[PDB]
Amino acid sequence: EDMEPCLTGTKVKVKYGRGKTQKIYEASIKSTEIDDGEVLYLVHYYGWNVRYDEWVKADRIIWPLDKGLEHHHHHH
């Protein structure tokens, strides 16, 4: 029993900056929700905290879209 999750399989680039905790990570989308008017994503850091993960807004995400992006044989 399943349902289609919120755009899973998509690895994106995520920024998160607060104080010293400023990184730009590669993460996979787990789920997406609308939390108080805005859409927040629950992203899964690839190589980091694998249980709780983190919530970031669309603003802090770099979506795969051609900005001069490679599409030959990594992810066509």
Side-chain angles (χ1 to χ4, degrees):
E1 301 308 274
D2 289 76
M3 79 296 297
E4 296 193 77
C6 308
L7 51 295
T8 30
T10 319
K11 76 165 185 173
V12 299
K13 234 294 194 298
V14 176
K15 182 180 295 180
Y16 194 87
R18 51 180 57 170
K20 302 181 302 182
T21 304
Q22 173 65 89
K23 297 80 169 58
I24 310 78
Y25 318 88
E26 286 176 66
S28 306
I29 303 302
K30 302 235 297 194
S31 304
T32 323
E33 287 185 65
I34 293 63
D35 182 73
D36 188 78
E38 54 184 63
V39 194
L40 303 182
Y41 291 80
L42 205 190
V43 306
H44 180 79
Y45 298 124
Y46 194 105
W48 292 271
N49 46 266
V50 66
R51 267 64 60 127
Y52 186 77
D53 287 301
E54 180 62 274
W55 292 79
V56 298
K57 190 181 181 177
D59 180 270
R60 272 186 169 146
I61 306 182
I62 302 83
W63 290 95
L65 203 295
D66 181 69
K67 63 284 273 63
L69 189 60
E70 206 300 285
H71 284 124
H72 290 90
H73 196 234
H74 294 97
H75 190 273
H76 177 75

Coordinates of all heavy atoms in Angstrom, one line a residue:
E1 N 0.8 -1.2 0.0 CA 0.0 0.0 0.0 C 0.9 1.2 0.0 O 1.7 1.4 0.9 CB -0.9 0.0 1.2 CG -1.8 -1.2 1.3 CD -2.6 -1.4 0.0 OE1 -3.7 -0.8 -0.2 OE2 -2.1 -2.2 -0.9
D2 N 0.7 2.1 -1.0 CA 1.5 3.3 -1.2 C 0.7 4.4 -1.7 O -0.5 4.2 -1.9 CB 2.6 3.0 -2.2 CG 3.7 2.1 -1.8 OD1 3.5 0.9 -1.8 OD2 4.9 2.6 -1.5
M3 N 1.3 5.5 -1.8 CA 0.8 6.7 -2.5 C 2.0 7.4 -3.1 O 3.1 7.0 -2.7 CB 0.0 7.6 -1.5 CG 0.9 8.5 -0.6 SD 1.9 7.7 0.6 CE 0.7 6.8 1.6
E4 N 1.8 8.3 -4.0 CA 2.9 9.0 -4.5 C 3.4 10.0 -3.5 O 2.6 11.0 -3.2 CB 2.5 9.6 -5.9 CG 2.2 8.6 -7.0 CD 2.2 9.2 -8.3 OE1 3.3 9.5 -8.9 OE2 1.1 9.5 -8.9
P5 N 4.6 9.9 -3.1 CA 5.2 10.9 -2.1 C 5.4 12.3 -2.8 O 5.2 12.4 -4.0 CB 6.5 10.3 -1.7 CG 6.4 8.9 -2.1 CD 5.6 8.9 -3.4
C6 N 5.9 13.2 -2.0 CA 6.1 14.5 -2.5 C 7.5 14.6 -3.2 O 8.5 14.8 -2.6 CB 6.0 15.5 -1.4 SG 4.5 15.4 -0.4
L7 N 7.4 14.3 -4.5 CA 8.6 14.4 -5.4 C 9.9 13.7 -4.9 O 11.0 14.4 -4.9 CB 8.8 15.7 -6.3 CG 8.8 17.1 -5.6 CD1 7.4 17.5 -4.9 CD2 9.9 17.3 -4.6
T8 N 9.8 12.5 -4.5 CA 10.8 11.7 -4.0 C 11.8 11.2 -5.1 O 11.3 11.1 -6.3 CB 10.3 10.6 -3.2 OG1 9.0 10.2 -3.8 CG2 10.1 11.0 -1.7
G9 N 13.0 11.1 -4.8 CA 14.0 10.6 -5.8 C 14.7 11.8 -6.4 O 15.7 11.7 -7.2
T10 N 14.3 13.0 -6.0 CA 14.9 14.2 -6.4 C 15.9 14.6 -5.4 O 15.6 14.8 -4.2 CB 13.8 15.3 -6.5 OG1 12.6 14.8 -7.0 CG2 14.3 16.5 -7.3
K11 N 17.2 14.7 -5.8 CA 18.2 15.2 -5.0 C 18.4 16.6 -5.4 O 18.4 17.0 -6.6 CB 19.5 14.5 -5.0 CG 20.4 14.6 -6.2 CD 21.8 14.1 -5.9 CE 22.8 14.4 -7.0 NZ 24.2 14.1 -6.6
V12 N 18.4 17.5 -4.5 CA 18.5 18.9 -4.7 C 19.7 19.4 -3.9 O 20.4 18.7 -3.2 CB 17.2 19.6 -4.2 CG1 16.0 19.1 -5.0 CG2 17.0 19.4 -2.7
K13 N 19.9 20.7 -4.0 CA 21.0 21.3 -3.4 C 20.3 22.2 -2.3 O 19.4 22.9 -2.6 CB 21.7 22.1 -4.4 CG 23.2 21.9 -4.4 CD 23.9 22.3 -3.2 CE 25.4 22.4 -3.4 NZ 26.0 21.1 -3.7
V14 N 20.7 22.1 -1.1 CA 20.1 22.8 0.0 C 21.1 23.7 0.8 O 22.2 23.3 1.0 CB 19.4 21.8 1.0 CG1 18.8 22.5 2.2 CG2 18.4 21.0 0.3
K15 N 20.6 24.9 1.1 CA 21.4 25.8 1.8 C 20.8 26.0 3.2 O 19.5 25.9 3.3 CB 21.5 27.2 1.2 CG 22.3 28.2 1.9 CD 22.3 29.6 1.2 CE 23.0 29.5 -0.2 NZ 23.0 30.8 -0.9
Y16 N 21.6 26.1 4.2 CA 21.1 26.3 5.6 C 22.1 27.1 6.3 O 23.3 26.7 6.4 CB 21.0 24.9 6.2 CG 20.2 24.8 7.5 CD1 18.8 24.6 7.5 CD2 20.8 24.8 8.7 CE1 18.1 24.5 8.6 CE2 20.1 24.7 9.9 CZ 18.7 24.5 9.9 OH 18.0 24.3 11.0
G17 N 21.8 28.3 6.8 CA 22.7 29.1 7.4 C 22.2 29.8 8.6 O 21.3 30.7 8.5
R18 N 22.8 29.5 9.8 CA 22.5 30.1 11.0 C 23.7 30.1 11.9 O 24.1 29.0 12.4 CB 21.3 29.5 11.7 CG 21.2 28.0 11.9 CD 20.0 27.6 12.6 NE 18.8 28.0 11.9 CZ 17.5 27.6 12.2 NH1 17.3 26.6 13.1 NH2 16.5 28.1 11.5
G19 N 24.4 31.2 12.0 CA 25.6 31.3 12.8 C 26.8 30.6 12.2 O 27.1 31.0 11.1
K20 N 27.3 29.7 12.9 CA 28.4 28.9 12.3 C 27.9 27.8 11.5 O 28.6 27.3 10.6 CB 29.3 28.3 13.5 CG 29.8 29.3 14.5 CD 30.7 28.7 15.5 CE 29.9 27.6 16.3 NZ 30.7 27.0 17.4
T21 N 26.7 27.4 11.7 CA 26.0 26.4 11.0 C 25.5 26.9 9.6 O 24.4 27.3 9.5 CB 24.9 25.8 11.8 OG1 25.4 25.3 13.1 CG2 24.2 24.6 11.1
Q22 N 26.5 27.0 8.7 CA 26.2 27.5 7.4 C 26.8 26.5 6.4 O 28.1 26.4 6.4 CB 26.8 28.9 7.2 CG 26.7 29.4 5.7 CD 25.3 29.6 5.2 OE1 24.8 30.7 5.3 NE2 24.8 28.6 4.6
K23 N 26.0 25.8 5.7 CA 26.5 24.8 4.8 C 25.6 24.9 3.6 O 24.5 25.5 3.6 CB 26.5 23.4 5.2 CG 27.4 23.1 6.4 CD 26.9 23.4 7.7 CE 27.7 22.8 8.8 NZ 29.1 23.3 8.7
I24 N 26.0 24.3 2.5 CA 25.3 24.1 1.4 C 25.4 22.6 1.0 O 26.5 22.1 0.6 CB 25.7 25.0 0.1 CG1 25.8 26.5 0.5 CG2 24.6 24.8 -1.0 CD1 27.1 26.9 1.2
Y25 N 24.4 21.8 1.3 CA 24.4 20.4 1.2 C 23.7 19.9 0.0 O 23.0 20.6 -0.7 CB 23.6 19.8 2.4 CG 23.8 20.4 3.8 CD1 22.9 21.5 4.2 CD2 24.6 19.9 4.8 CE1 23.0 22.0 5.4 CE2 24.7 20.5 6.1 CZ 23.8 21.5 6.4 OH 23.8 22.1 7.7
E26 N 23.9 18.6 -0.3 CA 23.1 17.9 -1.3 C 22.1 17.0 -0.5 O 22.5 16.3 0.4 CB 23.9 17.0 -2.2 CG 24.8 17.8 -3.2 CD 25.7 16.9 -4.0 OE1 25.2 16.1 -4.8 OE2 26.9 17.0 -3.9
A27 N 20.8 17.2 -0.8 CA 19.8 16.5 0.0 C 18.8 15.9 -1.0 O 18.6 16.3 -2.1 CB 19.2 17.4 1.0
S28 N 18.0 15.0 -0.5 CA 17.0 14.4 -1.2 C 15.6 14.8 -0.6 O 15.6 15.0 0.6 CB 17.1 12.9 -1.2 OG 18.4 12.5 -1.7
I29 N 14.6 15.0 -1.4 CA 13.3 15.4 -0.9 C 12.6 14.2 -0.3 O 12.6 13.2 -0.9 CB 12.5 16.1 -2.0 CG1 13.2 17.3 -2.6 CG2 11.1 16.5 -1.4 CD1 13.6 18.4 -1.6
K30 N 12.1 14.4 0.9 CA 11.4 13.4 1.6 C 9.9 13.6 1.5 O 9.1 12.7 1.1 CB 11.7 13.4 3.1 CG 13.2 13.2 3.3 CD 13.4 12.0 4.3 CE 12.7 12.3 5.6 NZ 13.2 11.3 6.6
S31 N 9.5 14.8 1.8 CA 8.1 15.2 1.8 C 8.0 16.7 1.7 O 9.0 17.4 1.8 CB 7.4 14.8 3.1 OG 7.6 13.4 3.3
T32 N 6.9 17.2 1.4 CA 6.6 18.6 1.3 C 5.3 18.9 2.0 O 4.4 18.1 1.9 CB 6.5 19.1 -0.2 OG1 7.4 18.4 -1.0 CG2 6.9 20.5 -0.3
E33 N 5.3 20.0 2.7 CA 4.1 20.4 3.4 C 3.9 21.9 3.3 O 4.9 22.7 3.1 CB 4.0 20.0 4.9 CG 3.8 18.5 5.1 CD 3.6 18.2 6.5 OE1 2.7 18.6 7.2 OE2 4.5 17.4 7.1
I34 N 2.7 22.4 3.6 CA 2.4 23.7 3.7 C 2.2 24.0 5.1 O 1.3 23.5 5.8 CB 1.1 24.1 2.9 CG1 1.3 24.0 1.3 CG2 0.7 25.6 3.2 CD1 1.6 22.6 0.8
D35 N 3.1 24.8 5.7 CA 3.1 25.1 7.1 C 3.0 26.6 7.3 O 3.9 27.3 7.0 CB 4.3 24.5 7.8 CG 4.4 24.7 9.3 OD1 3.6 24.1 10.0 OD2 5.2 25.5 9.7
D36 N 1.8 27.0 7.6 CA 1.4 28.4 7.9 C 1.7 29.3 6.6 O 2.6 30.0 6.6 CB 2.1 29.0 9.2 CG 1.6 30.4 9.5 OD1 0.5 30.5 10.1 OD2 2.3 31.3 9.2
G37 N 0.9 29.0 5.6 CA 0.9 29.8 4.4 C 2.0 29.5 3.4 O 1.9 29.7 2.2
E38 N 3.1 28.9 3.8 CA 4.3 28.7 2.9 C 4.6 27.2 2.8 O 4.2 26.4 3.7 CB 5.5 29.5 3.3 CG 5.9 29.4 4.8 CD 7.1 30.3 5.0 OE1 6.9 31.6 5.0 OE2 8.2 29.9 5.3
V39 N 5.3 26.9 1.7 CA 5.6 25.5 1.5 C 7.0 25.2 1.9 O 8.0 25.8 1.5 CB 5.5 25.1 0.0 CG1 5.5 23.6 -0.2 CG2 4.3 25.8 -0.7
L40 N 7.1 24.2 2.8 CA 8.3 23.8 3.4 C 8.6 22.4 3.0 O 7.6 21.6 2.8 CB 8.3 23.9 4.9 CG 8.0 25.3 5.5 CD1 8.0 25.2 7.0 CD2 8.9 26.3 5.0
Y41 N 9.8 22.1 2.7 CA 10.2 20.8 2.3 C 10.9 20.1 3.4 O 11.6 20.8 4.2 CB 11.1 20.9 1.1 CG 10.4 21.3 -0.2 CD1 10.2 22.6 -0.5 CD2 10.1 20.4 -1.2 CE1 9.6 23.0 -1.7 CE2 9.5 20.8 -2.4 CZ 9.3 22.1 -2.6 OH 8.7 22.5 -3.8
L42 N 10.8 18.9 3.4 CA 11.5 18.1 4.4 C 12.6 17.4 3.5 O 12.3 16.7 2.6 CB 10.6 17.0 5.0 CG 11.0 16.5 6.4 CD1 10.1 15.3 6.7 CD2 12.4 16.2 6.6
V43 N 13.8 17.7 3.8 CA 14.9 17.2 3.0 C 15.8 16.3 3.8 O 15.8 16.4 5.0 CB 15.7 18.4 2.4 CG1 14.8 19.4 1.7 CG2 16.5 19.1 3.4
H44 N 16.4 15.4 3.1 CA 17.2 14.4 3.7 C 18.6 14.6 3.2 O 18.9 14.4 2.1 CB 16.7 13.1 3.2 CG 17.4 11.9 3.7 ND1 17.3 11.3 4.9 CD2 18.3 11.0 3.1 CE1 18.0 10.3 5.1 NE2 18.6 10.0 4.0
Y45 N 19.5 14.9 4.2 CA 20.8 15.2 3.8 C 21.6 14.0 3.5 O 21.6 13.0 4.3 CB 21.5 16.0 5.0 CG 20.9 17.3 5.3 CD1 20.5 17.6 6.6 CD2 20.8 18.3 4.3 CE1 19.9 18.8 6.8 CE2 20.2 19.5 4.6 CZ 19.8 19.8 5.8 OH 19.2 21.0 6.1
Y46 N 22.2 13.9 2.4 CA 22.9 12.8 1.9 C 24.3 12.7 2.5 O 25.2 13.4 2.0 CB 22.9 12.8 0.3 CG 23.2 11.5 -0.3 CD1 22.2 10.7 -1.0 CD2 24.5 11.1 -0.4 CE1 22.6 9.6 -1.6 CE2 24.9 9.9 -1.0 CZ 23.9 9.1 -1.6 OH 24.2 7.9 -2.2
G47 N 24.4 12.0 3.5 CA 25.7 11.8 4.2 C 25.7 12.4 5.6 O 26.7 12.3 6.4
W48 N 24.6 13.0 6.0 CA 24.4 13.6 7.3 C 23.2 12.9 8.0 O 22.7 11.8 7.6 CB 24.2 15.1 7.2 CG 25.4 15.8 6.7 CD1 26.4 16.3 7.5 CD2 25.8 16.2 5.3 NE1 27.3 17.0 6.7 CE2 27.0 16.9 5.4 CE3 25.2 15.9 4.1 CZ2 27.6 17.4 4.3 CZ3 25.8 16.4 3.0 CH2 27.0 17.1 3.0
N49 N 22.7 13.6 9.1 CA 21.6 13.1 9.9 C 20.4 12.4 9.1 O 19.6 13.0 8.5 CB 21.0 14.3 10.7 CG 20.8 15.6 10.0 OD1 21.6 16.5 9.9 ND2 19.7 15.7 9.2
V50 N 20.5 11.1 9.2 CA 19.6 10.2 8.4 C 18.2 9.9 9.1 O 17.4 9.3 8.5 CB 20.4 8.9 8.1 CG1 20.7 8.1 9.3 CG2 19.8 8.1 7.0
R51 N 18.1 10.3 10.4 CA 16.8 10.0 11.0 C 15.8 11.2 11.1 O 14.6 11.1 10.7 CB 16.9 9.5 12.5 CG 17.0 8.0 12.6 CD 18.2 7.4 11.9 NE 19.4 7.8 12.4 CZ 20.4 7.1 12.8 NH1 20.3 5.7 12.9 NH2 21.6 7.6 13.2
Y52 N 16.2 12.3 11.6 CA 15.3 13.4 11.8 C 15.2 14.3 10.6 O 14.2 14.8 10.2 CB 15.6 14.3 13.1 CG 14.5 15.3 13.4 CD1 13.3 15.0 13.9 CD2 14.8 16.7 13.1 CE1 12.4 16.0 14.1 CE2 13.9 17.7 13.3 CZ 12.6 17.3 13.8 OH 11.7 18.3 14.1
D53 N 16.3 14.5 9.9 CA 16.4 15.3 8.7 C 16.1 16.8 9.0 O 16.2 17.2 10.2 CB 15.6 14.7 7.5 CG 16.3 13.5 6.9 OD1 17.4 13.6 6.5 OD2 15.6 12.4 6.9
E54 N 15.8 17.6 8.0 CA 15.5 19.0 8.3 C 14.5 19.6 7.3 O 14.3 19.1 6.2 CB 16.9 19.8 8.3 CG 16.8 21.3 8.6 CD 16.2 21.6 9.9 OE1 15.0 21.7 10.0 OE2 17.0 21.8 10.8
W55 N 13.9 20.7 7.7 CA 12.9 21.4 6.9 C 13.5 22.7 6.4 O 14.1 23.5 7.2 CB 11.7 21.7 7.8 CG 10.9 20.5 8.2 CD1 11.2 19.6 9.2 CD2 9.7 20.0 7.6 NE1 10.2 18.6 9.2 CE2 9.3 18.9 8.3 CE3 8.9 20.5 6.5 CZ2 8.1 18.2 7.9 CZ3 7.8 19.9 6.2 CH2 7.4 18.7 6.9
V56 N 13.4 22.8 5.1 CA 13.9 24.0 4.5 C 12.8 24.5 3.5 O 12.0 23.7 3.1 CB 15.2 23.9 3.7 CG1 16.4 23.5 4.6 CG2 15.1 22.8 2.6
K57 N 12.8 25.8 3.2 CA 11.8 26.3 2.4 C 12.4 26.3 1.0 O 13.6 26.3 0.8 CB 11.5 27.8 2.8 CG 10.3 28.4 2.1 CD 10.1 29.8 2.7 CE 8.9 30.5 2.0 NZ 8.7 31.9 2.6
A58 N 11.5 26.4 0.0 CA 11.9 26.4 -1.5 C 13.0 27.4 -1.8 O 13.8 27.2 -2.7 CB 10.6 26.7 -2.3
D59 N 13.0 28.5 -1.0 CA 13.9 29.6 -1.2 C 15.4 29.1 -1.0 O 16.3 29.5 -1.8 CB 13.6 30.7 -0.2 CG 14.5 31.9 -0.3 OD1 15.6 31.9 0.4 OD2 14.2 32.8 -1.0
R60 N 15.6 28.3 0.0 CA 16.9 27.8 0.3 C 17.3 26.6 -0.5 O 18.4 26.0 -0.2 CB 17.0 27.5 1.8 CG 17.4 28.6 2.7 CD 17.6 28.1 4.1 NE 18.3 29.1 5.0 CZ 18.0 29.2 6.3 NH1 17.1 28.5 6.9 NH2 18.7 30.2 7.0
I61 N 16.6 26.2 -1.5 CA 16.9 25.1 -2.2 C 17.3 25.5 -3.6 O 16.9 26.5 -4.1 CB 15.6 24.1 -2.3 CG1 15.1 23.8 -0.9 CG2 16.0 22.8 -3.1 CD1 13.9 22.8 -0.9
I62 N 18.2 24.7 -4.2 CA 18.6 24.9 -5.5 C 18.0 23.7 -6.2 O 18.4 22.6 -6.0 CB 20.2 24.9 -5.8 CG1 20.9 26.0 -5.0 CG2 20.5 25.0 -7.3 CD1 21.3 25.7 -3.5
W63 N 17.1 23.9 -7.1 CA 16.4 22.9 -7.8 C 17.1 22.5 -9.0 O 17.8 23.4 -9.7 CB 15.0 23.3 -8.1 CG 14.1 23.3 -6.8 CD1 13.8 24.4 -6.1 CD2 13.5 22.2 -6.2 NE1 13.1 24.0 -5.0 CE2 12.9 22.7 -5.1 CE3 13.4 20.8 -6.5 CZ2 12.1 21.9 -4.2 CZ3 12.7 20.0 -5.7 CH2 12.1 20.5 -4.6
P64 N 17.1 21.2 -9.4 CA 17.7 20.8 -10.6 C 16.8 21.3 -11.7 O 15.6 21.1 -11.8 CB 17.6 19.2 -10.6 CG 17.4 18.9 -9.1 CD 16.6 20.1 -8.6
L65 N 17.5 22.1 -12.5 CA 16.9 22.8 -13.6 C 18.1 23.3 -14.3 O 19.1 23.5 -13.6 CB 16.0 24.0 -13.0 CG 14.9 24.6 -13.9 CD1 15.4 25.3 -15.2 CD2 13.9 23.6 -14.2
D66 N 18.1 23.5 -15.5 CA 19.2 23.9 -16.2 C 19.7 25.3 -16.0 O 19.0 26.3 -16.3 CB 19.1 23.7 -17.7 CG 20.4 24.1 -18.4 OD1 21.4 23.4 -18.2 OD2 20.4 25.2 -19.1
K67 N 20.8 25.4 -15.3 CA 21.4 26.7 -15.1 C 22.8 26.5 -15.7 O 23.8 27.2 -15.3 CB 21.5 27.1 -13.6 CG 22.3 26.2 -12.6 CD 21.5 24.9 -12.3 CE 20.6 25.0 -11.1 NZ 19.5 26.0 -11.2
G68 N 22.9 25.6 -16.6 CA 24.2 25.1 -17.2 C 24.5 23.8 -16.5 O 25.6 23.6 -16.0
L69 N 23.5 23.0 -16.5 CA 23.5 21.7 -15.8 C 23.9 20.6 -16.8 O 23.4 20.6 -17.9 CB 22.2 21.5 -15.2 CG 22.1 20.3 -14.2 CD1 23.1 20.5 -13.1 CD2 20.7 20.2 -13.6
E70 N 24.6 19.7 -16.3 CA 25.1 18.5 -17.1 C 23.8 17.6 -17.1 O 23.2 17.3 -16.1 CB 26.2 17.9 -16.2 CG 27.2 17.1 -17.0 CD 26.6 15.9 -17.7 OE1 26.3 14.9 -17.1 OE2 26.5 16.0 -18.9
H71 N 23.6 17.0 -18.3 CA 22.4 16.1 -18.5 C 22.8 15.0 -19.5 O 21.9 14.5 -20.3 CB 21.1 16.8 -19.0 CG 20.4 17.6 -17.9 ND1 20.1 18.9 -18.1 CD2 19.9 17.2 -16.8 CE1 19.4 19.3 -17.0 NE2 19.3 18.3 -16.2
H72 N 24.0 14.5 -19.5 CA 24.4 13.5 -20.5 C 24.2 12.1 -19.9 O 23.5 11.3 -20.5 CB 25.8 13.7 -21.0 CG 26.0 14.8 -22.0 ND1 26.4 16.1 -21.5 CD2 26.0 14.9 -23.3 CE1 26.6 16.9 -22.6 NE2 26.3 16.2 -23.6
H73 N 24.9 11.8 -18.7 CA 24.8 10.5 -18.2 C 24.9 10.4 -16.7 O 25.2 9.4 -16.1 CB 25.8 9.6 -18.9 CG 25.6 8.1 -18.7 ND1 26.5 7.2 -18.3 CD2 24.5 7.3 -19.0 CE1 26.0 6.0 -18.2 NE2 24.8 6.0 -18.7
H74 N 24.7 11.5 -16.0 CA 24.7 11.5 -14.6 C 23.2 11.4 -14.2 O 22.8 10.6 -13.3 CB 25.4 12.7 -13.9 CG 26.8 12.8 -14.2 ND1 27.4 13.6 -15.2 CD2 27.9 12.3 -13.5 CE1 28.7 13.5 -15.1 NE2 29.0 12.7 -14.1
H75 N 22.4 12.3 -14.8 CA 21.0 12.3 -14.7 C 20.5 13.1 -15.9 O 20.6 14.3 -15.9 CB 20.5 13.0 -13.4 CG 19.1 12.9 -13.1 ND1 18.1 13.8 -13.6 CD2 18.4 12.0 -12.3 CE1 16.9 13.4 -13.1 NE2 17.1 12.4 -12.4
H76 N 20.0 12.3 -16.9 CA 19.6 12.9 -18.2 C 18.3 13.6 -18.1 O 17.2 12.9 -18.0 CB 19.6 11.8 -19.2 CG 19.2 12.2 -20.6 ND1 19.9 13.0 -21.4 CD2 18.0 12.0 -21.2 CE1 19.3 13.2 -22.6 NE2 18.1 12.5 -22.5

